[PDB]
Amino acid sequence: RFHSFSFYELKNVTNNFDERPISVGGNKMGEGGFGVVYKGYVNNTTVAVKKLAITTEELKQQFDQEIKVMAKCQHENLVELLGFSSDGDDLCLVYVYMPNGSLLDRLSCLDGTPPLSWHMRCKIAQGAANGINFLHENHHIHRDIKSANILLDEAFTAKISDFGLARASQTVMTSRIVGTTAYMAPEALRGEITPKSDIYSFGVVLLEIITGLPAVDEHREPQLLLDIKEEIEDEEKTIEDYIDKKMNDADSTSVEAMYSVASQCLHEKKNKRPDIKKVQQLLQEMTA
Numbered sequence: 589r590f591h592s593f594s595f596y597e598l599k600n601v602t603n604n605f606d607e608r609p610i611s612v613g614g615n616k617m618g619e620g621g622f623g624v625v626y627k628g629y630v631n632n633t634t635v636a637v638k639k640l641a642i643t644t645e646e647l648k649q650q651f652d653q654e655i656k657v658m659a660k661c662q663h664e665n666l667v668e669l670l671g672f673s674s675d676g677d678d679l680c681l682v683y684v685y686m687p688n689g690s691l692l693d694r695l696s697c698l699d700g701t702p703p704l705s706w707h708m709r710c711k712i713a714q715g716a717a718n719g720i721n722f723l724h725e726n727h728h729i730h731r732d733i734k735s736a737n738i739l740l741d742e743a744f745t746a747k748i749s750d751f752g753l754a755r756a757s758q759t760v761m762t763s764r765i766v767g768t769t770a771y772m773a774p775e776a777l778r779g780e781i782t783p784k785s786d787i788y789s790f791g792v793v794l795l796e797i798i799t800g801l802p803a804v805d806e807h808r809e810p811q812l813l814l815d816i817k818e819e820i821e822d823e824e825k826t827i828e829d830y831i832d833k834k835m836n837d838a839d840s841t842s843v844e845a846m847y848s849v850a851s852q853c854l855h856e857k858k859n860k861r862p863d864i865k866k867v868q869q870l871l872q873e874m875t876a
């Protein structure tokens with residue numbers, strides 16, 4: 589199944605887990621839930637190595653869950669686990685490297701990368717929906733769908749990542765509220781666990797893709813991106829006022845169609861949101 593690595597190997601291949609950012613000579617590519625993701629080089633392959641870093645038993649459960657989800661769920665719109673390490677007191681997960689990093693970072697053009705075209709943004713939206721559909725068809729709920737979690741390969745194929753908190757499946761509740769508040773549905777923020785909450789967060793991701801803005805920005809008004817939906821519905825603004833200006837191939841018709849998907853995902857009432865299959869078909873129609 590997955591390759592078993594010993595910690596020593598992964599130390600050696602990451603400049604001993606050099607935590608400086610890759611841009612300044614280290615191996616750190618970013619930080620990712622409850623761990624740091626390092627670049628490694630092993631037997632002709634660049635790999636991503638997440639070393640997990642709030643108790644030990646809970647961290648270990650998240651590690652075991654990541655492994656179980658990935659063993660059951662292989663799909664081109666999900667991240668691929670190559671292996672792991674559990675010997676000693678560290679836990680590592682080793683994945684196929686995604687050379688274009690996160691959607692978040694490509695939206696902000698971090699490190700000077702060129703802006704994504706509308707045509708590419710449409711493919712990424714479709715791919716990400718196809719990943720989430722796969723997960724929901726397999727009765728998993730992700731719980732932290734966001735742009736920082738949609739990775740992008742050499743061809744800008746979208747891959748969903750981070751399954752440490754994912755859950756199997758009738759809407760249950762929890763005491764341990766998890767996710768990222770800027771993306772989270774009202775009912776997730778109160779502790780329900782439902783696939784309908786992934787739909788909502790995807791909504792926010794769709795806004796990010798349209799606008800190029802982050803989901804939250806403390807120095808902006810509104811500080812939360814999901815607030816623009818209300819500005820647009822209460823006639824104060826149009827989707828055209830917010831469309832990312834860093835593209836020249838966006839047409840009104842497809843942009844309005846993606847915004848219409850996003851609006852529907854973002855319904856306050858969970859039972860009025862489309863399910864992922866519907867999102868997927870709408871996103872396919874936007875492009876046809």
Ligand SMILES: O=C(Nc1cc2nc(N3CCOCC3)oc2cc1N1CCCCC1)c1cccc(-c2cnc3[nH]ccc3c2)n1
Binds near residue numbers: 618668684687690737
């Ligand atoms: O290759 C991976 N991540 C990655 C690659 C990056 N590459 C780049 N660049 C190369 C070209 O130009 C700009 C900088 O930046 C990258 C950032 C990442 N991630 C992005 C999410 C945070 C972890 C590191 C990768 C592959 C498979 C799984 C994961 C992964 C696994 N678990 C995760 N939990 C939260 C995030 C997360 C990410 N990450």
